Each structure stands twice: as C-alpha cells, then as structure tokens.
Amino acid sequence: QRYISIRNTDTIWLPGNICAYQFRLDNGGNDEGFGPLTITLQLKDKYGQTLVTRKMETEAFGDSNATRTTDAFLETECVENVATTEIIKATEESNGHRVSLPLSVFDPQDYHPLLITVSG
Amino acid sequence: QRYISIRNTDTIWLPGNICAYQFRLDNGGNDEGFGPLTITLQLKDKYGQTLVTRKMETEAFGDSNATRTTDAFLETECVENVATTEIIKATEESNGHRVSLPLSVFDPQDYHPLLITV
Numbered sequence A: 001q002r003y004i005s006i007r008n009t010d011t012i013w014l015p016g017n018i019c020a021y022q023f024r025l026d027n028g029g030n031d032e033g034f035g036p037l038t039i040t041l042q043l044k045d046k047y048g049q050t051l052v053t054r055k056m057e058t059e060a061f062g063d064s065n066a067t068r069t070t071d072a073f074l075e076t077e078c079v080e081n082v083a084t085t086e087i088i089k090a091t092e093e094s095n096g097h098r099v100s101l102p103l104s105v106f107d108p109q110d111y112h113p114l115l116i117t118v119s120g
Numbered sequence B: 001q002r003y004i005s006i007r008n009t010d011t012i013w014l015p016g017n018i019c020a021y022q023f024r025l026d027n028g029g030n031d032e033g034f035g036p037l038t039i040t041l042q043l044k045d046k047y048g049q050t051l052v053t054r055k056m057e058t059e060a061f062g063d064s065n066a067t068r069t070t071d072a073f074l075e076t077e078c079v080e081n082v083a084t085t086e087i088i089k090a091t092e093e094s095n096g097h098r099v100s101l102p103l104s105v106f107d108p109q110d111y112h113p114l115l116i117t118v
C-alpha cells in the first residue's frame, strides 16, 4: 500500500549504560501519511542469534512534504553486540484506534553499506 | 558554502564480476545546485588500507525540487574486502570549466548502521 523506507542512522550512548539506536523513517515523498506507529524489533548478534526484543514508537508523519521523514529511537542496554534488527510486528494509531500495519510497507536497509569518510 | 550529504545505498553485482556501488547525494534542499561532479574515491579494506582508487561521475543536481537528490554508481572489478571509502577529491563541471570542489562541502555517512530485515 504505502511506503516506508527505514534505516539506522545513529547510535547514541546514554547514561545508565543505555544505547539508543536512531531510525529514520521516510515515505519517499508520497504524501499519503501515517499515524503514530508501534514497531517491534528483534535485536540480533552477528551470528543471527536473538538478544532482546524491544518496541519502538514513532510520531505521525508523511501527510505533507516537509514531514516526509520522522525519527524514532530504540532503547536497550548497550551491553549487547547488536549487529542486526528484524521487524516482526507493526501497529498504527489511526483514528485514535489500534490498527495492524502490513510489514510489506517497509523498505528496510538490509545491507551493510560502505562507510564514507572525507580526506583532510 | 554549499552542502552535499552522501551515503552508500546498495551494491549491485553485475556480469563479468563487476560491482556497482550506489551513492545517494543530497544538497539538503538548497536552491543552489551542482554541475556534473567527478568524485575520486579511495576504496579501503576494514583495516583502512587503500585497495584501489576510482572515480565516480554524477549528473547535475540540486537545481530543481525533483533533483534535490541524485543517485550515482561506481563501477569497478568487484574488489574483495571493501569496507569503507574515502573522498580525496571532487571536481565540478561548471560553466565550461572543471572546477575543484572543497571537500568540506560533503557530509558523509561515517557510521556503520545496524542492518534491518523484515
């Protein structure tokens, strides 16, 4: 139906040994938007073993052009060698109502990208 | 000055063992665009050692609201152990001249992201 590209854009080290993984969600400029989302992710090590399962909440976005993206944060104890995350469930707050969101909507970054630096 | 965010968005395996590294460039929504760019990249292993040095060319962009971003591809013999790339030079085709582009303009993705599956 609708489109959400999703990728991890940063990792923030917080007090209390918490790591906050920042995800940017983007509707690609299709300005058919989304209500508040609830996303459940399995955090996995490099071997593919499940570490923890956590939920992530997003604001409503995408019904306009300068609201095409929104940022969400996933919190867990930073003591985990997290390498990948798998979206296993998603919920949309629309109409003040609980509605299930099809996982096919997501366009995840399922590839290790080249890191880019700039010379001095 | 001007702004270009840049990140690697996919790797495409081609016949003849060629790899196409896809880059997304974004001028952040400014009304000042860029002529065709020629970008020189050091492809490096994970240890930071330079493997090969290659050039990447882009279309002109940032000059209309539907060209705020552009996608470029770097084709090379799909070279084993590339982990990172470093921008060491950039040249802009502007007004009949090849002009040097200050590297400070670039806002690179200098971060290893979590992989996401569904």
Ligand SMILES: [Cl-]
Residues within 6 Å of the ligand: none
């Ligand atoms: Cl044209």
Ligand code: NA
Residues within 6 Å of the ligand: none
């Ligand atoms: Na440690």
